[PDB]
Amino acid sequence: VSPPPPIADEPLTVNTGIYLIECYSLDDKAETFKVNAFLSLSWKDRRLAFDPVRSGVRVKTYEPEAIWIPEIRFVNVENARDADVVDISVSPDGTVQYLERFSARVLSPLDFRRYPFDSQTLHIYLIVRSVDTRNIVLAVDLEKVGKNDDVFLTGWDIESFTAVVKPANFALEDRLESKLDYQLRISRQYFSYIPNIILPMLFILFISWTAFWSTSYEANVTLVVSTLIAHIAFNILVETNLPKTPYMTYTGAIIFMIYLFYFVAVIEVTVQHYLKVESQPARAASITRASRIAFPVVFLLANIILAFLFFG
């Protein structure tokens, strides 16, 4: 049809709101995730105003191809949403109630610095492009911004779903455009990692540390190298989760520290054997008895320092 006449030469205000129904398929590698929710638009148009007393009907329904509908689009989506118009009602005063259901794929960056214990914010952007005849600005209606109680996501705890009412009215392509932001804060469940990744790793490391209570060179070599192979296999198991990041994560630092500890243990075993062969048993005994105590204290101190750096 056409934009409404400027009765007061004012920018047009539309009220929005998204009622989440379900979210799923949070792909961490591609940083994409899908939604399925509602969309309520409530603008005002005086050209559609009628008299309810004469007509005798409280609200009379028009056709989507019979009226004008402002274009509402998402920024960070691979393809356009699948719009399923559900209801349209026109109030006698002029306000038009609109509703629709859609599903789309959304792109949002993710931070994996504190991989086991991290909280992510998922952003959904709503943008309307002003036409030359009339200016249209966005708004947020708090009575429709919510989520369904059946919204479930595997491995995450949904905490809140709020929208920032302040729009960023920038200018792109010589046109003024508004933008709304919807934030969905989530938190990862870290229960299934303590008995799956952390504790077996510590058990293997402690098993490898038993070589300081022995004097047989072959047994020590077997212990240390076979535990190193087991460490590599467990890293193979763990590697199916971590994406590629340009910074240093917690898990990568821990794994590198474990590799360093294995190298130092091999060096110590070789030094002990070499001193024992060269007819200096007392020095080797002192070195191994001091290594026994020095290894785990240093391991605990390094873990404490890494935790104090990454988490504060």
For Cl ion, give the closer residue by CB, 84 or 93. Answer: 84
The CA angle 191-193-196, to the nearest 5 degrees, is 125
Q: What CA–CA distance (Å, rounded) separates 241 from 236?
A: 10
For ligand PEE, give the closer residue by CB, 112 or 209. Answer: 209
For ligand PEE, give the closer residue by CB, 184 or 275. Answer: 275
Q: Is 144 in the site for a copy of itself (CB under 8 A)?
A: yes
Instruction: Give the range of 72-80, 122-130, 156-164, 300-308 binding Cl ion by CB under 5 A.
Output: 72-80
Judge whether 178 and 138 are in contact, CB under 8 Å: yes
Judge whether 94 and 44 are in contact, CB under 8 Å: yes
Q: 209 touches which of ligand PEE, a copy of itself, Cl ion, none (CB within 5 to 8 A by kind)?
A: ligand PEE
Site residues for Cl ion, window 78-117 (CB under 5 A)? 80-81
Work out whether the CA dihedral 76, 80, 86, 88 comes out positive or negative.
Answer: positive
What is the total residue count of the chain?
Answer: 312
Q: Is 279 in the site for a copy of itself (CB under 8 A)?
A: no
Q: Is 38 in the site for Cl ion (CB under 5 A)?
A: no
Q: Is 55 in the site for a copy of itself (CB under 8 A)?
A: no
Is 98 in a helix, a strand, or coil? strand
Which residues lie near ligand PEE (CB under 6 A)?
Answer: 189-191, 194-195, 206, 209-210, 213, 246, 267, 270-271, 274-275, 278, 296
For a copy of itself, give the closer residue by CB, 75 or 301. Answer: 75
Nearest alpha-carbon partner for 10 in 39, 42, 43, 59 = 43
For ligand PEE, give the closer residue by CB, 55 or 280. Answer: 280
Q: 218 touches which of ligand PEE, Cl ion, a copy of itself, none (CB within 5 to 8 A by kind)?
A: a copy of itself
Q: Is 214 in the site for a copy of itself (CB under 8 A)?
A: yes
Q: 74 touches which of Cl ion, ligand PEE, a copy of itself, none (CB within 5 to 8 A by kind)?
A: Cl ion
Q: Is 299 in the site for a copy of itself (CB under 8 A)?
A: no
For a copy of itself, give the closer residue by CB, 117 or 203. Answer: 203
* Element holding 300 (H helix, E strand): helix 281-310
Instruction: Give the range of 41-49, 71-79, 288-296, 301-309 binding a copy of itself by CB under 8 A.
Output: 71-79
Judge whether 271 and 287 are in contact, CB under 8 Å: yes
Nearest alpha-carbon partner for 258 in 287, 298, 311, 223 = 298
Contacts of residue 143, defined as CB under 8 A and 6 or more positions apart, other chains included, come to 17
* Element holding 309 (H helix, E strand): helix 281-310
CB 203 to ligand PEE: min, Å: 9
Size of the site for a copy of itself (CB under 8 A): 95
CA-to-CA separations, 17 to 59, 140, 286, 304, in angstroms, rounded: 22, 6, 72, 45
Work out whether the CA dihedral 146, 123, 69, 47 comes out positive or negative.
Answer: positive
Among 81, 134, 273, 276, binds a copy of itself (CB under 8 A): 273
Site residues for a copy of itself, window 226-245 (CB under 8 A)? 226-230, 232-237, 239, 243-245
Size of the site for Cl ion (CB under 5 A): 4
Among 29, 46, 73, 175, binds Cl ion (CB under 5 A): 73
Judge whether 134 and 12 are in contact, CB under 8 Å: yes
In the complex, which residues of this chain contact Cl ion (CB under 5 A)?
Answer: 73-74, 80-81
